[PDB]
């Protein structure tokens, strides 16, 4: 379970696919080139949030030890972190990441299986801890932690 030499060799070969230059780091253009061959055209803003998601040194560099961490989340069938991301952005417009309590109460009582009024009141009370009314949907970071 300690990633024997043959197993590391397989990941070494996979790493060289993105790392065309052979220096040992994956740049934004190196990653973007691969995704363009697969039928995707992401912007530099979309690209930037992927490196720093896995990057730990804060230098825009993806070395071999960091490349392994990215694979672990990718090979997973379902990621509870990412699935909740896609749910909010369906109802989250303006690209700001904030949901008012007016729309949150409406969607949860009319769309889907529908909650009940006292449940959403408790949910909003727990969700709107700040009390400003603008509920940034990043509350799931502490919601799934427990």
């Amino acid at each position: 379970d300690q990633l024997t030499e043959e197993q590391i060799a397989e990941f070494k070969e996979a790493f060289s696919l993105f790392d065309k230059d052979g220096d040992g780091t994956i740049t934004t253009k190196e990653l973007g080139t691969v995704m363009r061959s697969l039928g995707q055209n992401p912007t530099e803003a979309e690209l930037q949030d992927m490196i720093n998601e896995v990057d730990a040194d804060g230098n825009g560099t993806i070395d071999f030890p960091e490349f392994l961490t990215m694979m672990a989340r990718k090979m997973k069938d379902t990621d509870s972190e990412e699935e909740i991301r896609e749910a909010f952005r369906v109802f989250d417009k303006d690209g700001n990441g904030y949901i008012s309590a007016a729309e949150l109460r409406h969607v949860m009582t009319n769309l889907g299986e529908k909650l009940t009024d006292e449940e959403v009141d408790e949910m909003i009370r727990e969700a709107d801890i700040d009390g400003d009314g603008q509920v940034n949907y990043e509350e799931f970071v502490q919601m799934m932690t427990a």
């Binding site: 379902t78 699935e83 909740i84 896609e86 749910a87 909010f88 369906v90 109802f91 969607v107 949860m108 769309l111 889907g112 299986e113 529908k114 909650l115 449940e119 408790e122 949910m123 727990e126 799931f140 919601m143 799934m144 427990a146």
Partner: protein, 361 residues
């Protein structure tokens, strides 16, 4: 000039008129032959006077048809002379024009002549391999080939074609160098209305082939199997579709040849018909656009519903495990199962919407 166009137009009408009489005098002979064949089996014999009268009528019609063909070809040679600036008719014989005239004469000259002639016929029965011998009349040999007179219908259709007899059509075609032969009209009809052509051809072939099979099977069938008209119709239908013969194998090579021709025709007719049917079931542009619009709306609604379900399932788990004091593990396990199911539904509907948007263009 005025005279040149006027003279050319007169020959077109003269040639058009002569084609209808030939068709009339061919169809009359075919119908009389069919009636004589049907009535000479049970009503009277071959030594009576009705057969003599009917065969005399057939011979007279044949003579008139041959004369009409000769006059038609003379008029066509005159038209050829006018259309090429030639002042001698001998420049029109090319070892190919002569051959087809003789072929037409030979085809239209065959008919049952009056008299009384017989021969000996021997056949091998089917499924029993028993010999069978009988004496038959020669007129059955001379009357079957009479169906070859059907090539005049194509000529009449070509000479009466709207494209062939329209000044604007010819004027436009001249600029583009288009040959207005008989093959162009058939392809135009196939492009416009293929189903009608296929249906008419299939029905005519069905009836004619069934009658021919019955006529050749009369002489050696003493059990009312292949001489029945409905049985012949069914046999032709099942040979056309290539299902099999059942117990309806002919004892004569007429039946074998007709079945072979029917199978050869059906092999291609089936493919053409199914291609036409497949082409007739597609949508047009406007209805495609309306369908795409409605599908996009439905997918949007379902995506929103799945996204709502995901968040509903997430909150409950927390509520029933942190906020609540005692922990009912069955409830949290059920909610986690529903959470996974909602995630799968959401990704499925998103994939479907992406596929629709990718295939729309």
């Amino acid at each position: 000039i005025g005279y040149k166009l006027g003279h050319r137009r007169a020959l077109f009408e003269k040639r058009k008129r002569l084609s209808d009489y030939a068709l009339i005098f061919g169809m009359f002979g075919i119908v009389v032959m069919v009636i004589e064949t049907e009535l000479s089996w049970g009503a009277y014999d071959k030594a009576s006077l009705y057969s003599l009268a009917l065969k005399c009528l057939i011979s007279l019609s044949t003579i008139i048809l041959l004369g009409l063909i000769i006059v038609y070809h003379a008029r066509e040679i005159q038209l050829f002379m006018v259309d090429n600036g030639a002042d001698d008719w001998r420049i029109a014989m090319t070892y190919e024009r002569i051959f087809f005239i003789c072929l037409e004469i030979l085809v239209c000259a065959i008919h049952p002549i009056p008299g009384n002639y017989t021969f000996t016929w021997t056949a091998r029965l089917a499924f029993s391999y028993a010999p069978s011998t009988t004496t038959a009349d020669v007129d059955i040999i001379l009357s079957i080939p009479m169906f070859l007179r059907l090539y005049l219908i194509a000529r009449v259709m070509l000479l009466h074609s709207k494209l062939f007899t329209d000044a604007s059509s010819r004027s436009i075609g001249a600029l583009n160098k288009i040959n207005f032969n008989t093959r162009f009209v058939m392809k135009t009809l196939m492009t416009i209305c293929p189903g009608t052509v296929l249906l008419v051809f299939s029905i005519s072939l069905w009836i004619i082939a069934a009658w021919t099979v019955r006529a050749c099977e009369r002489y050696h069938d003493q059990q009312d199997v292949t001489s029945n008209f409905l049985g012949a119709m069914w046999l032709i239908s099942i040979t056309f579709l290539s299902i099999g013969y059942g117990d309806m194998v002919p004892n004569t090579y007429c039946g074998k040849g007709v079945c072979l021709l029917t199978g050869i025709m059906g092999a291609g007719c089936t493919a053409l018909v199914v291609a036409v049917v497949a082409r007739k079931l597609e949508l047009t542009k406007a209805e495609k656009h309306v369908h795409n619009f409605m599908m996009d709306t439905q997918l949007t609604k379902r995506v929103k519903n799945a996204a709502a379900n995901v968040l509903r399932e997430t909150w409950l788990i927390y509520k029933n495990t942190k906020l609540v004091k005692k922990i009912d593990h069955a409830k949290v396990r059920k909610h986690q199962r529903k959470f996974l199911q909602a995630i799968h539904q959401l990704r499925s509907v998103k994939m479907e919407q992406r596929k629709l948007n990718d295939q729309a263009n």
